[PDB]
């Protein structure tokens, strides 16, 4: 009779049929992913059409249900999650225009063709052309020309579509009762109805400012170190006191600096950490790799994998007999079913990726009994944060030697420690300032505080001081350089990377504290320690049924994200950087430009 029971019945029924419908859709998707066939194309076409229609119909049906302040904070989150119709709140013509613009940008990004004037007909695309051209060759002129040509051929046409896309998203968020699209995206972290733990949308911005103001010192220290190294390499093209060029960062857009580790290696003669020779000697396969993974997670106490995964999933590539994608993906079929897309190779990298994915599946059945919509994290960050904490647990030298892959006689040395910490800092720590800056720029653009005539000028200015990098070629108002990025064109937020990194470092410190480890944090190992596994499972079992702040506070006891674990992790690196950069200039000048004469 009462609306409470009505909502309960609606949610129960929706879960009951949505679990099987999503199982059907995911099995069609997997049959495609291991067998790329046209009938499978029709399969996910029909599956997605039916799923979208069904969810939209029940969203419209539940849009009328009264919200009579229902207790237990259980049906609420579900109904506010399913009540976001999206593009149907406004006229369907605008939704079709939005879909057309999305398709246009996706197709143009997938066809961002650039060709040289020497051979206009014979040229390479973005993938894997520029990646291999500039990830291996170090030709300054060629890299600069390729970067400039890519920007010219993308942004000059992508500027309008991006402008009306931002306008459409902002006005839809206003129709969705939001200040802008950025505030809509920040609404994922919003917590309401939990007194003493509610989180506001501006609280996230203030806290990210607070974290960045202590993240910075390591950032300019590594920036000074890489500037000195590149001056030693290329002094005639890079000023020792100015900002770096943006075309020598290893990747198109400054996401990672790992490609520059070889050029900036402190010791290029010491042997690197690698057991690929051990893999060749012992002929370990994916079966064995997942066997030691199951041993790892039995040692921590967590239930081992379901056998149906063993006799149902694919672990070895089938060759060219059937078409499949080699990109690592973990698929939650539902009903206790989980699958993997990978093309396994005999190396440490595939070892790490396989463990990362399988621990993703582990975290996924950590909340297996949870209802359908709650079979996820409170944000898009718990999944990869868990993946990275277990990756760091498996990557410690103690685990490497103990499992017999590395003989104890090799052990470890200070130079190897410096190399490993430098790789970790370049791969993970370096990404944070750039992602934060671009997310802040996107937030300002959505808020409308950035006029359309100031877009690229403020982009490059924030590059100059906030990021510390300059463009060597001037650009005019026709460009759309911010839209060059992958997920910008795919319309995906980037603060997930920063949140995931902070979460992974915090949980690494908390787990090592639970393991009572002393000394360096990178040497910390969690193997055969039941208390840490149980403490982690205590919150892993809840999933997203509780606010993210509450889940975070379960093990660390802290209400807010902190960078203290990162500083404790990189303190030896910080001391080494301080010792090395005593005679190295610190700071960057924004006014300096490579094109100045």
């Amino acid at each position: 009779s009462t609306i409470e029971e009505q909502a309960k019945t609606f949610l129960d029924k929706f879960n009951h049929e949505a679990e099987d419908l999503f199982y059907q859709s995911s099995l069609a998707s997997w049959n495609y992913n291991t067998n790329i066939t046209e009938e499978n194309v029709q399969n996910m076409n029909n599956a997605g059409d039916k799923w979208s229609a069904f969810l939209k119909e029940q969203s419209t049906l539940a849009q009328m249900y009264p919200l009579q302040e229902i207790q237990n904070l259980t049906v609420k989150l579900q109904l506010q999650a399913l009540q976001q119709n999206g593009s149907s709140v406004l006229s369907e013509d605008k939704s079709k225009r939005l879909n057309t613009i999305l398709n246009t940008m996706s197709t143009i990004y997938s066809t961002g063709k650039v060709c040289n004037p020497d051979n206009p007909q014979e040229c390479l695309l973005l993938e894997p052309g520029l990646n291999e051209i500039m990830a291996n060759s170090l030709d300054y002129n060629e890299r600069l020309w390729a970067w400039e040509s890519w920007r010219s051929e993308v942004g000059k046409q992508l500027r309008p579509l991006y402008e009306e896309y931002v306008v459409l998203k902002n006005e839809m968020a206003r129709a969705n009762h939001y200040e802008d699209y950025g505030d809509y995206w920040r609404g994922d972290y919003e917590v309401n109805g939990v007194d003493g733990y509610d989180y506001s949308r501006g609280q996230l911005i203030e806290d990210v400012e607070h974290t960045f103001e202590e993240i910075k010192p390591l950032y300019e220290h590594l920036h000074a170190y890489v500037r000195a190294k590149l001056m030693n390499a290329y002094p005639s093209y890079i000023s020792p006191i100015g900002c770096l060029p943006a075309h020598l960062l290893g990747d198109m857009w400054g996401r990672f600096w790992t490609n520059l580790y070889s050029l900036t290696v402190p010791f290029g003669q010491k042997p690197n950490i690698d057991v690929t020779d051990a893999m060749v000697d012992q002929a370990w396969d994916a079966q064995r790799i997942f066997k030691e993974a199951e041993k790892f997670f039995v040692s921590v106490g967590l239930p081992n994998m379901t056998q149906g995964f063993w006799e149902n999933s694919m672990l070895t590539d089938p060759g060219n007999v059937q078409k499949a994608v080699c990109h690592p993906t973990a698929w939650d079929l539902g009903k206790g079913d989980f699958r993997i897309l990978m093309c396994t190779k005999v190396t440490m990298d595939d070892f790490l990726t396989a463990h990362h994915e399988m621990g993703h599946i582990q975290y996924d059945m950590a909340y297996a009994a949870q209802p359908f919509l709650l079979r996820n994290g409170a944000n898009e960050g718990f999944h990869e944060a868990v993946g990275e904490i277990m990756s760091l647990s498996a990557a410690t030298p103690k685990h490497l030697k103990s499992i017999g892959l590395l003989s104890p006689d090799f052990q470890e040395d200070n130079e190897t420690e410096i190399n490993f910490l430098l790789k970790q800092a370049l791969t993970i720590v370096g990404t944070l300032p750039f992602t934060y800056m671009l997310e802040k720029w996107r937030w300002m653009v959505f808020k409308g505080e950035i006029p359309k005539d100031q877009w690229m000028k403020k982009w490059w200015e924030m590059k100059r001081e906030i990021v510390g990098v300059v463009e060597p070629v001037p650009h005019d108002e026709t460009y759309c350089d911010p839209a060059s990025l992958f997920h910008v064109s795919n319309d995906y937020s980037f603060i997930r990377y920063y949140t995931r990194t902070l979460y992974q470092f915090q949980f690494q410190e908390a787990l090592c504290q639970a393991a009572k480890h002393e000394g360096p944090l990178h040497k910390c190992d969690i193997s055969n320690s039941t208390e840490a596994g149980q403490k982690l499972f205590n919150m892993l079992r809840l999933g997203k049924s509780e606010p993210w702040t509450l889940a975070l506070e379960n093990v660390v006891g802290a209400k807010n994200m902190n960078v203290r674990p990162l500083l404790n992790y990189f303190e030896p690196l910080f001391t080494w950087l301080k010792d090395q950069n005593k005679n190295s200039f610190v700071g960057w000048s924004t006014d300096w430009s490579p094109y100045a004469d």
């Binding site: 019945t9 009951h16 099987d20 099995l27 049906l61 379901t306 149906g308 995964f309």
Partner: protein, 98 residues
């Protein structure tokens, strides 16, 4: 079967708790609210039966399990059903017990 064994049905929307050993077979239309639905089975009025299909790909803990329960009672009546006897093989021409 590989496609789906949607041949079993099970109720989840009974008004109250079912009495033990009670049959409640009825093709009625459950109601969720105050409007007296007249069998339209549309909004806020759902069919009490839900899909109960199964597939071989399902993992442990969700695959179908056939279950049987045997009911016993001790009301006063002549013996009807009971177990057999030990039946030791016969021995002859010796002082034994029977």
């Amino acid at each position: 079967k590989v496609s789906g064994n949607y041949n079993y049905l099970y109720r989840l929307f009974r008004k109250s708790k079912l009495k033990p050993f009670e049959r409640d077979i009825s093709t009625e239309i459950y109601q969720a609210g105050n409007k007296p639905c007249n069998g339209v089975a549309g909004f806020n009025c759902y069919f009490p039966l839900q899909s109960y299909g199964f597939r071989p790909t399902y993992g442990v803990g969700h695959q179908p399990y056939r279950v049987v329960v045997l009911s016993f009672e001790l009301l006063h009546a002549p013996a009807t059903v009971c177990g057999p006897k030990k039946s030791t093989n016969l021995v002859k021409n010796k002082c034994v017990n029977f």
